[PDB]
Amino acid sequence: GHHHHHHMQAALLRRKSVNTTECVPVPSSEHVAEIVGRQGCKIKALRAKTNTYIKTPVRGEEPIFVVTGRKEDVAMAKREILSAAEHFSMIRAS
RNA sequence: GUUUAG
């Protein structure tokens, strides 16, 4: 709800425990789809696991996630997104 | 043996 959004922005403004925001590109919206999962189940699990705010890109726009949180947490979420994107490329590529 | 949540 709005409480979560407001508190998230307040945490960014303190720049204590949340201190990093990074763009994480993947090759295509099809990659985005498989990384996010149905109903966003996989990207929501990733946010929970890494304690990160993640913005999923809209289909048809640039397939680039934005990941925000503690530096080491953003690095873990970025690692998992990029590894997932490479996974789907390796197993789907013709 | 995966295919877009707020």
UniProtKB/Swiss-Prot annotation:
Q: Where in the cell is it found?
A: Cytoplasm; Nucleus
Q: In which tissues is it expressed?
A: Highest levels found in fetal brain and testis. Also expressed in thymus, salivary gland and uterus. Highly expressed in cells of the innate immune system, in particular activated NK cells. Week expression in the intestine.
Give every KH domain span: 20-81
Provide the domain comment.
Answer: Binds RNA through its KH domains.
Q: What does this protein do?
A: E3 ubiquitin ligase responsible for the post-transcriptional regulation of common HLA-A allotypes. Binds to the 3' UTR of HLA-A2 mRNA, and regulates its levels by promoting mRNA decay. RNA binding is sufficient to prevent translation, but ubiquitin ligase activity is required for mRNA degradation.
- What is the disease in the record? Genetic variations in MEX3C may be associated with susceptibility to essential hypertension.
Could you give the subunit structure recorded for this chain?
Interacts with USP7, which antagonizes the ability to degrade mRNA.
Protein name as annotated: RNA-binding E3 ubiquitin-protein ligase MEX3C
Species name: Homo sapiens (Human)
The record's gene field reads: MEX3C
